[PDB]
Design an enzyme around this catalytic site. Structure first.
Site, short mmCIF file in Angstrom:
data_model
loop_
_atom_site.label_atom_id
_atom_site.label_comp_id
_atom_site.label_asym_id
_atom_site.label_seq_id
_atom_site.Cartn_x
_atom_site.Cartn_y
_atom_site.Cartn_z
N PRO B 131 -5.20 -0.65 -2.82
CG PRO B 131 -6.79 -0.19 -3.97
CD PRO B 131 -5.29 -1.79 -3.55
CD1 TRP B 132 -6.48 4.82 -0.13
CD2 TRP B 132 -8.37 4.99 -0.25
NE1 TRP B 132 -6.41 5.96 -0.89
CE2 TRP B 132 -8.43 6.21 -0.84
CE3 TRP B 132 -10.07 4.97 -0.44
CZ2 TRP B 132 -8.29 6.16 -2.16
CZ3 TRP B 132 -10.76 5.43 -1.43
CH2 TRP B 132 -9.88 6.49 -2.18
CE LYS B 156 2.18 -0.29 0.97
NZ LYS B 156 1.34 0.63 1.62
N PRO B 157 -0.59 -3.25 2.32
CG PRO B 157 -1.41 -3.11 4.59
CD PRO B 157 -0.52 -3.96 3.90
CB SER B 207 -3.17 6.05 -8.77
OG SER B 207 -1.39 6.27 -7.82
CB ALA B 209 0.23 8.34 -10.57
CD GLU B 226 -6.79 -5.64 -12.19
OE1 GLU B 226 -7.87 -4.61 -13.00
OE2 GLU B 226 -7.84 -6.39 -12.49
CB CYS B 259 -11.77 0.21 -10.31
SG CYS B 259 -12.17 -0.87 -9.78
N1 LIG Z 1 -8.96 -3.47 -10.11
C1 LIG Z 1 -8.98 -2.61 -10.37
O1 LIG Z 1 -8.07 -1.76 -11.69
C2 LIG Z 1 -8.61 -1.69 -9.42
C3 LIG Z 1 -9.39 -1.22 -8.70
C4 LIG Z 1 -8.84 -1.01 -7.66
C5 LIG Z 1 -9.16 0.04 -7.50
N2 LIG Z 1 -8.46 0.96 -8.39
C6 LIG Z 1 -7.86 1.92 -9.20
O2 LIG Z 1 -7.09 2.55 -7.59
C7 LIG Z 1 -6.92 3.93 -7.10
C8 LIG Z 1 -6.58 4.00 -6.41
O3 LIG Z 1 -5.78 5.02 -5.84
P1 LIG Z 1 -5.14 5.49 -4.88
O4 LIG Z 1 -4.84 6.50 -4.38
O5 LIG Z 1 -5.44 4.78 -3.52
O6 LIG Z 1 -3.60 4.01 -5.34
P2 LIG Z 1 -2.35 4.31 -4.91
O7 LIG Z 1 -1.83 4.05 -6.63
O8 LIG Z 1 -2.00 5.50 -4.44
O9 LIG Z 1 -2.08 3.69 -4.05
C9 LIG Z 1 -2.50 1.73 -3.48
C10 LIG Z 1 -1.38 1.18 -3.21
O10 LIG Z 1 -0.01 1.59 -4.15
C11 LIG Z 1 0.84 1.90 -2.95
N3 LIG Z 1 2.00 2.87 -3.81
C12 LIG Z 1 1.64 3.74 -4.38
N4 LIG Z 1 2.30 4.50 -5.16
C13 LIG Z 1 3.47 2.98 -5.36
C14 LIG Z 1 4.96 2.84 -5.63
N5 LIG Z 1 5.46 3.91 -6.00
N6 LIG Z 1 5.13 1.92 -5.34
C15 LIG Z 1 4.74 1.46 -4.82
N7 LIG Z 1 3.52 1.06 -4.15
C16 LIG Z 1 2.68 2.23 -4.47
C17 LIG Z 1 0.22 2.57 -1.82
O11 LIG Z 1 1.01 2.62 -0.27
C18 LIG Z 1 -1.04 1.56 -1.47
O12 LIG Z 1 -0.88 0.95 -0.85
C19 LIG Z 1 -8.55 4.16 -8.03
O13 LIG Z 1 -7.66 4.83 -9.86
C20 LIG Z 1 -8.75 3.27 -9.28
O14 LIG Z 1 -9.30 3.09 -9.66
C21 LIG Z 1 -8.26 -0.49 -9.67
#
Ligand SMILES: NC(=O)c1ccc[n+]([C@@H]2O[C@H](COP(=O)([O-])OP(=O)(O)OC[C@H]3O[C@@H](n4cnc5c(N)ncnc54)[C@H](O)[C@@H]3O)[C@@H](O)[C@H]2O)c1
Ligand SMILES: NC(=O)c1ccc[n+]([C@@H]2O[C@H](COP(=O)([O-])OP(=O)(O)OC[C@H]3O[C@@H](n4cnc5c(N)ncnc54)[C@H](O)[C@@H]3O)[C@@H](O)[C@H]2O)c1
Lengths: 450, 447
Positions: B131-132, B156-157, B207, B209, B226, B259
């Site tokens: 994620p970002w 894949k960032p 996320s 979802a 994660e 997180c």
């Molecule tokens: N260690 C941990 O458990 C941890 C660490 C950091 C962040 N997080 C969680 O990450 C979340 C960040 O939210 P966000 O909206 O930036 O995340 P997101 O799930 O929208 O995006 C994360 C990454 O996944 C990609 N992605 C999104 N949907 C996808 C799919 N269906 N298939 C494949 N790739 C996909 C995105 O392009 C991006 O690179 C928060 O809920 C945070 O708690 C968890």
């Protein structure tokens, strides 16, 4: 509304009724998960010393009742007496192994990892684990899952295959006496019972079974922790200096449990120089193995028809069929003979499919490198063997083979201390060894400011 | 090829136009990593560790560029980005060392007449989707153990933060070899194409979802998840004097986009008002735009607005908004303390992912624990108190992969992190992370 789903189970050796059993539906699955959930806090709160002692008594109780387990296991499988007796022994041994392993675990070293902080790492159970297991090794596959799961402090809902509920029901009875009520709960049923359990309020699913079921479970398990052990399509690479007993040993492994093993040898791969020796040697060894005398039936009518279909679809130019000798009055059993198939293409159905019966295919390669390419050329990657005399040749192949187990000059020999587990489409679970515990527990870092 | 037009979250203005990878680019990236896999896996542990040590040192040699790159799409303060560059290199050094120091079930005569041993082997090509919120550190968490275990990696960032992942690929090419680490910028559909490609495993951080979608899409690939946290901080009446300042410091780090950030403060009834007022005083000193950065994008800022508007909090303390001149168009949102709220309030149940703390009171430590463990997510937690038996008993009972006592949000490469419940079941940091990226093989030899 009064409602009971019923199965009339038959003995695979005879085709006759052996047991009428009610199948668990949604109410019974929901109740079983609630029972295991309710037992969870007291079971997880035991010290390792007390938990290990319970598992040691559990194993000794199984052993004390071993003759009853043997009969139960054979009733739905047709296993020979000696194979069932060995598997009851292996079940109890695996429980003892995990009873001892759960006290001997390690974690990342504690101490001053951050300035001014004391930190340590403890291991903690997931909660309730669903264990869903097939009919080929009802008792051992149950033990592989519940052993480490229970030892890690989880409670367990165990869902045995439709045709083999018997030892899983005995396990639940004997766990209640030694582990406590509700720690291990058994729900008999067919595939629908398994699907209901995957969607229930369990924290993890430990599945052993078909690839198609595995793929279905991945979707519907959601975010539950998932451990899969799926099919194997195991190669046996036979070099020209393989030992004299190679063919007897391979046929012994292929006819164990009537060839119904994930890790049985299936794809024999020779070089050009020993190809015909191997075909004839395997055919002679297999011919001495008579279905109904030297090994049991296939589990059910679907398995026997599947055997028939794959054999019919194969383009094998060579086919050696062993004798079929069902005992008197057992003609209605699902008996199928040993077969050796040779002279066939690399994409033949008998090569590419998991026959799950005592059928060996034989292919020839130009050199060890092509033999390795054939051996690693299937999507499944579970177990393998190499047969040969020269240390450098066989140990190099052993490192290159894509498998969780590689036997050299043997096959299908397992023990509680050493891991088993697949790659590719075989799932990524780990069964046996201390490595299996990690699938059922999670670390917690505690970091304390000073 | 589509082009993404990225903006600076501090200003709202355009900052970078970068190709958004589709199927042809994803497919070629996976083939490049696959082609590098055999020579990378064939390195001895000595040579592979030396490569990873040089990778870590090259990153630190170029830390100024990594800091600029990391800040460009996040708005991170310079000190936070600089510290994360140091943590990135340290994590790589940790796994360079850990990969030589591993163990296996002991070899020998386990079966009569057999010699057996156990070796570890890589999976192959691992997809790392991150994620970002911590682009560089979350990349490090995944690629570190994956590369150390002998895998090659397609990284894949997130759409808004490809910048440091591109630098990692350049510096990996110079120290690990070409194609060992391949970076593919793109959006969530780029990620979905990578999940469906010929990779052997998927290591995902993001996320809930997305995780739920990936479970179904990944098939039989090995999967590590994660996901979100919703972390409680249990504050007992004898908590140390700096408790509120320390919780606010952790909650405003990275503008609360963590997180494991503290979210749900849970007190007892006797210290509830003291906590609300102490947190509000400490938060009031943290001004968005001066003391911490923006939210990542307009979607995050709108999500903040929706949760806050939906909350039924009877008490609301809002910290100041102070974006510098010229930064009025950035995604700035202030720190907030919310209190007097029901146990199912939206601000309590949702991961706000911003510098917002809710405060709830419980009757006794037993009910404080029930509240702290009463969420589907279970990732990290903290306990604040002076008495050893009380805080350590709570630390054992909390459902979390990390419990801090009288601190929060303090991590190091040796100690594991990882969720339960709906937070996923992956393990990041520590030697334990390596197991996700390798498989054992038993070799058993007849004597
Ligand atoms: N260690 C941990 O458990 C941890 C660490 C950091 C962040 N997080 C969680 O990450 C979340 C960040 O939210 P966000 O909206 O930036 O995340 P997101 O799930 O929208 O995006 C994360 C990454 O996944 C990609 N992605 C999104 N949907 C996808 C799919 N269906 N298939 C494949 N790739 C996909 C995105 O392009 C991006 O690179 C928060 O809920 C945070 O708690 C968890
Ligand atoms: N990898 C291993 O260690 C290992 C060990 C033993 C068997 N196997 C494999 O298992 C297979 C045996 O085939 P089978 O026909 O007995 O398997 P199967 O998948 O039909 O049945 C296995 C079990 O899963 C249940 N089940 C089936 N579909 C389900 C679903 N969608 N959801 C939940 N539960 C479901 C069944 O009721 C049964 O209890 C072979 O491929 C064999 O190689 C693997």
């Amino acid at each position: 509304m009064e409602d009971t789903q019923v199965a009339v189970l038959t003995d695979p050796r005879t085709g006759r009724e052996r047991r009428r059993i009610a199948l668990a539906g949604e109410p019974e699955v929901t109740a079983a998960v609630a029972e295991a959930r309710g037992a969870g806090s007291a079971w997880a709160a035991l010290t390792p010393r007390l938990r290990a002692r319970c598992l040691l008594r559990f194993a000794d109780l199984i052993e004390e009742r071993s003759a009853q387990y043997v009969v139960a296991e054979r009733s739905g499988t047709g296993k020979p007496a000696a194979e069932a007796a060995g598997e009851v022994e292996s079940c109890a041994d695996l429980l003892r192994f995990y009873a001892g392993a759960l006290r001997a675990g390690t974690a990342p070293a504690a101490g001053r990892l951050l300035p001014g902080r004391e930190s340590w790492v403890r291991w903690e159970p997931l909660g309730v684990v669903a264990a869903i297991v097939p009919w080929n090794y009802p008792l051992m596959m149950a033990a592989w899952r519940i052993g480490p799961a229970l030892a890690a402090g989880n409670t367990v809902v165990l869902k045995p295959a439709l045709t083999t509920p018997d030892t899983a029901l005995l396990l639940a009875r004997d766990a209640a006496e030694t582990l406590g009520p509700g720690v291990l709960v058994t729900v008999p049923g067919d595939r629908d019972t398994g699907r209901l359990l995957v969607e229930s309020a369990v924290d993890a699913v430990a599945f052993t079974g078909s690839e198609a079921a595995g793929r279905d479970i991945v979707g519907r398990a959601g975010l539950r922790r998932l451990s899969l052990e799926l099919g194997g399509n195991c190669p046996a690479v036979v070099l020209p200096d393989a030992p004299p007993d190679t063919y007897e040993a391979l046929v012994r492994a292929a006819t164990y449990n009537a060839g119904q093993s994930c890790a049985s040898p299936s794809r024999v791969i020779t070089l050009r120089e020993n190809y015909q020796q191997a075909v004839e040697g395997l055919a002679k060894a297999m011919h001495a193995r008579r279905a109904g005398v030297d090994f049991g039936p296939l589990n059910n009518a679907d398995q026997a028809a599947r055997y028939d279909r794959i054999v019919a679809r194969s383009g094998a130019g060579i086919e050696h069929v062993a004798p079929l000798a069902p005992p008197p009055g057992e003609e209605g059993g699902h008996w199928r003979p040993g077969r050796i198939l040779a002279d066939l293409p690399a994409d033949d159905p008998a090569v590419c499919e998991e026959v799950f019966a005592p059928v060996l295919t034989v292919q020839a390669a130009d050199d060890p490198a092509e033999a390795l390419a054939l051996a690693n050329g299937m999507p499944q990657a579970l177990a393998a063997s190499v047969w040969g005399s020269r240390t450098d040749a066989v140990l190099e192949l052993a490192g290159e083979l894509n498998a969780g187990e590689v036997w050299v000059n043997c096959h299908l020999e397992q023990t509680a201390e050493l891991p088993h587990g697949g790659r590719g489409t075989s799932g990524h679970g780990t069964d046996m060894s201390v490595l299996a515990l990690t699938e059922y527990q999670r670390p917690k870092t505690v970091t304390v400011r000073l």
